[PDB]
From a paper:
In the 3′ to 5′ pathway, the [name] body is processively hydrolyzed by the 10-component cytoplasmic exosome complex (exo-10; exo-9 plus Rrp44/Dis3), followed by the removal of the cap structure of the remaining short RNA fragment by the [name] [name] (Dcs1p in yeast). The apo [name] decapping enzyme assembles into an 80-kDa symmetric homodimer that contains dimeric N- and C-terminal domains that are linked by a flexible hinge region. The enzyme possesses two bipartite active sites that are located at the interface between the N- and C-terminal domains. Upon substrate binding to the C-terminal part of one of the active sites, the N-terminal domain flips over to enclose the [name] substrate in a well-defined pocket.
Author numbering:
A (entry chain A): 1 to 92, 96 to 333
B (entry chain B): 1 to 333
Write the structure that this text describes.
Amino acid sequence: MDAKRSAEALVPRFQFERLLNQDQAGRRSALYGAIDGQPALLILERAPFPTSTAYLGRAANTLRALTNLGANDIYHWYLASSGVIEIPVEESDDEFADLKINLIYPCTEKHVKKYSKQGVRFVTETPEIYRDYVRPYMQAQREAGRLNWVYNIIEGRKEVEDVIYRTPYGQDPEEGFLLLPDLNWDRKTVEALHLLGIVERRDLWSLRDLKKKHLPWLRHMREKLIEATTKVYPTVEADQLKLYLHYQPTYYHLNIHIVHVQLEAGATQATGKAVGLESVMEQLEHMHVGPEDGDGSDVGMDRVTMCYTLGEASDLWVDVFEPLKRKKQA
Amino acid sequence: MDAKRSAEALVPRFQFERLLNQDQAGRRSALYGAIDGQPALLILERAPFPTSTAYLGRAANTLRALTNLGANDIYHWYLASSGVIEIPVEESEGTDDEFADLKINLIYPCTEKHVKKYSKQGVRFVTETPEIYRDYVRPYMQAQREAGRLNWVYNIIEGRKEVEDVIYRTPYGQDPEEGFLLLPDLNWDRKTVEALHLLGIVERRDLWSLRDLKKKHLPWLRHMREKLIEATTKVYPTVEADQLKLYLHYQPTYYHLNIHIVHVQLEAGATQATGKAVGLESVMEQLEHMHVGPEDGDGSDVGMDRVTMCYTLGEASDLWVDVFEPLKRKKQA
């Protein structure tokens, strides 16, 4: 393993310059620097704790340093440094690791931008702002071809082996769908289940397109997605799943997240990003039908004001909401 | 300093028995065991990385072990173990300290209450129709209030408790309808502005949860939204209005309306998750556009008690044990 030793030789040559970002409760730091006089990006992460009893049964008894910070009755808190614990013969001479390291070298300005801290803003999207600015932006993104990757999966030309369930392409153009594992799921831990329900029809760009006339479709899709998930993973019951939509979505083709209720909630589930599927259905169900609205078929989410988070490097913040904010402050 | 050394002697005597829970993306493990023949609960946490240049400028060059797992062009990924890095004199009160990679909490002797608190808990997603709210859940809320479970809230509202922890309030009694106070969330260190998490406890006592909100409350809601934001940005001048999110819990942990205020940069966890957190503006918009029927008059009493709400419950909670699990059991063949 010359390439393995070669890659290992890079890390001690890293010359730190500055911290780009620290996140994940402080347990991930993105460092910028240089190796051999060229830009280098080194990402430090605390590793998860081992579950081996060889580790858990020895961690408290092998510390290389331990400092009590305070105590109150039966409560005590400390800082400590891990000692060396060797991995037993039947699980590996290795020791248990406390760090994960990613090194991008040589890195570019694109990597610096990607891993630099990005501020977040909470914006207010009225029906007028959706009509005049956001919906035109969505259209341009789709016309530019940004959904090619989605369409390639829907049509069965990519990630065929990653799909865990689908209706065959073309068999059901209105209510067909496929289930894709989320990139961060190990596909083995059922209680961390996270699937993407990508619908086959192509005319719904986001929940903004949903109207009362889509309530039957929404009911059918909710049942079908839950039915398929609990069929593929039979130890999962219906009341152990949550279905939600993103707004703003990360891409402009309606897709329904399916997560196990036991999955640790992160940004993908947070208020200002995730909207429960049943919550959208109830808003359509009870939305007011005015005298000019006929039977109500076209009453829907494009009448609502939606408030949500955006990153400050996003197109929508830079081109729409920051300028609207500046124009209002003048 | 003797008590400091005494508490340090506890940790190496810990005898591991079993893992109670591992969460926070695997970086927190709650271990159950014994010390001196009595139950002990040891919680291991990965520490945040120092920002000190003395640490960051040496971490890559002092590793005590390093294994490359793979590489692809300019991408390389590894596992590693940290070496010893001493804290420089100008950053340490003591001498011969090294940067720490672990935080440890030891509860000893612990009880069954601590084991329950830190053990993994099953979760269920339930469907609360208006009928189930009427027949089962609202009576449960009422009994909780009648039992006195809100004594702690009222003690703070009335200025008998946590007077020193309130970061802002309207003086009690001055504004009975739109008065409020702001309390820091127990999990916030009260100094890191980008992790800000406040609880807005309203002065009025007749709103138990968002189920009580109706169209007639929309002016009150608009006013409270503004007032909570103005007060937060007044106390924390580096926070702008568009760097805050306001939300309600449903189910809430207690049955007196209270509005969470969080910095947009705060990392989202269970408290913000779908099935628990409901954005304040989302409730207001749901009330704004809700249908007013022919028997509803001017619509003033149309509100959230007409909606079906879906949310998560823990399997040890009263509502699961006494309401939703029995309803589920009776329905199943």
